[PDB]
Paper text:
Fusing pX to the C-terminus of the nanocage protein (‘EPN-pX’) in lieu of p6Gag did not interfere with nanocage assembly, and resulted in nanocages being visibly present within membrane-limited vesicles released from transfected 293T cells. Cryo-electron microscopy of purified EPN-pX nanocages showed no clearly discernable density for pX. However, we did observe significant decoration adjacent to the C-terminus of the nanocage protein, of the correct volume for pX, in a structure reconstructed from data collected on EPN-pX nanocages released by spontaneous lysis of EPN-filled vesicles during blotting and vitrification. It seems likely that surface tension during blotting drove vesicle lysis and rapid vitrification that allowed intact EPN-pX nanocages to be imaged and particles bearing pX to be reconstructed to low resolution. Mutational analysis identified a 24 amino acid peptide sequence located within the center of pX that was both necessary and sufficient for nanocage release.
Originally identified in virion assembly intermediates and found more recently in extracellular eHAV particles, the pX sequence is unique to hepatoviruses. pX is rapidly cleaved from VP1 upon loss of the eHAV membrane and is not present in nHAV. In this report, we show that pX contains crucial determinants of quasi-envelopment, acting as an adaptor that recruits ESCRT to the viral capsid by binding two distinct Bro1-domain proteins, ALIX and HD-PTP.
Numbering used by the authors: 0 to 201
Write the structure that this text describes.
């Protein structure tokens, strides 16, 4: 299901912005450019309102989730406002449990083998790898040995020059923030197109 969406789309826009209006415009830009998985981070002011106001894009096939979720209270608001998936930078046992009871897909972030194993023990096999620019594809390749059945979605520094290396290392999808989302709506929509083509291209 959610696994299958990540597998199909291969890219999630990690949307940080200074306002509701900027966040919505960038989410539309990205969608118009072919990115269907959209993660509204909780560093966006009133991130819940943004998720609720983008709810209609679901009817056009957009998949709207929440990122930078750091407490169960934030998790509740996101789900209440229609988030189809929850992402955090870290592994949160409390958010894991809440999302399990609520029946919503949670992708915790991990940076070490010990964190990875704890996440697996909590039932997760699709992991956010964060920050990707610190560990790199090297980390993803290293994990294939001992943990052949874990799959990563790196966030952090993924860009046009390295996106194909990441996929060569064995990642399931990539989460792209500033390389995709920074700039004006027009620039973002265009960069969205470039990433889709570059990803298809490899």
């Amino acid at each position: 299901k959610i696994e299958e969406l990540f597998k199909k789309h291969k890219i999630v826009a990690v949307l940080r912005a200074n306002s509701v209006e900027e966040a919505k415009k960038k989410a539309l830009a990205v969608f118009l450019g072919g990115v269907h998985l959209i993660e509204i981070t909780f560093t966006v002011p009133d991130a819940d309102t943004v998720i609720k106001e983008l709810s209609f894009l679901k009817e056009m096939g957009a998949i709207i989730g929440a990122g930078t979720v750091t407490s169960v209270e934030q998790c509740r608001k996101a789900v209440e406002s229609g988030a189809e998936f929850i992402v955090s930078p870290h592994l949160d046992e409390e958010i894991s449990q809440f999302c399990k009871e609520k029946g919503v897909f949670y992708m915790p972030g991990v940076m070490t083998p010990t964190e990875l194993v704890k996440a697996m023990k909590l039932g997760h096999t699709i992991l956010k790898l964060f920050p990707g620019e610190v560990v790199g594809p090297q980390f993803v390749k290293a994990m294939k040995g001992p943990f052949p059945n874990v799959k990563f979605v790196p966030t952090g520094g993924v860009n046009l020059d390295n996106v194909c290396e990441w996929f060569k290392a064995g990642v399931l999808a990539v989460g792209v923030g500033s390389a995709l989302v920074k700039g004006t709506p027009v620039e973002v929509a265009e960069k969205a197109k470039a990433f889709v083509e570059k990803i298809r291209g490899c």
